[PDB]
Design a protein around this ligand. Structure first.
Ligand SMILES: Brc1cnc(-n2cccn2)nc1
Length: 209
């Protein structure tokens, strides 16, 4: 069963802006997504200090980077707190509404896209390089869900039936045909050693057969 939703008007506008604006420094998407995953890991770690049973769904706190040249996908896997169905449908869009509006005022005030994470909406920078984004997430207090959107004002949420994750978030970037450089090993190594050397968790780059 798949439910389709509409993006709240403001982030429907931000996403079209990101997709349609000619902007060459597209590599900052990896910094933001890794930065988001690091925030997700910080959250589950802080909760475990007052409740070690929260790590029963997995103790390893790390981030994995998985390119796939055949499928033309770059997957980012963290073992952070994960996300609930209310997070994917309402809660985050409500916290982001002010950041989206503020980010768009700043874009006219001279600021460029690279500062998107400063407004707490850096996840949508994925659409700089991805035509479709699929998110598999698992929170301690919810089932496993699958989130997907190809921009255009709508997204879908369904109960995932594939391989269980235990706990964490998996962001699958179905890359644009001209953005395949982000599937190359030395390119990903450069972005991580230029944008995210000071992340407090291991960042493993899965290299291909
Ligand atoms: Br899936 C998914 C959906 N929305 C978001 N955000 C909204 C504002 C900031 N992040 N993150 C992940």
């Amino acid at each position: 069963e798949v439910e389709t939703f509409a993006f709240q008007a403001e982030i429907a506008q931000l996403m079209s802006l990101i997709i349609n604006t000619f902007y060459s420094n597209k590599e900052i998407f990896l910094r933001e997504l890794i930065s988001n995953s690091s925030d997700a890991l910080d959250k589950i770690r802080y909760e475990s200090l007052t409740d070690p049973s929260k790590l029963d769904s997995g103790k390893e706190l790390h981030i994995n980077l998985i390119p796939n040249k055949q499928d033309r996908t770059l997957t980012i896997v963290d073992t952070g707190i994960g996300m609930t169905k209310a997070d994917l449908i309402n809660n985050l869009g409500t916290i982001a509404k002010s950041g989206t509006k503020a980010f768009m005022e700043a874009l006219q005030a001279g600021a460029d896209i690279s500062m998107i994470g400063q407004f707490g909406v850096g996840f949508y920078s994925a659409y700089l390089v991805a035509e479709k984004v699929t998110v598999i997430t698992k929170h301690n207090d919810d089932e496993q869900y699958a989130w997907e959107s190809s921009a255009g004002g709508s997204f879908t949420v369904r109960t995932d039936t594939g391989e269980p994750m235990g706990r964490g978030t998996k962001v699958i970037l179905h890359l644009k045909e001209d953005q395949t450089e982000y599937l190359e090993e030395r390119r990903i190594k450069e972005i991580v050693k230029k944008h995210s050397q000071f992340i407090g968790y291991p960042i493993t780059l899965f290299v291909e057969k």
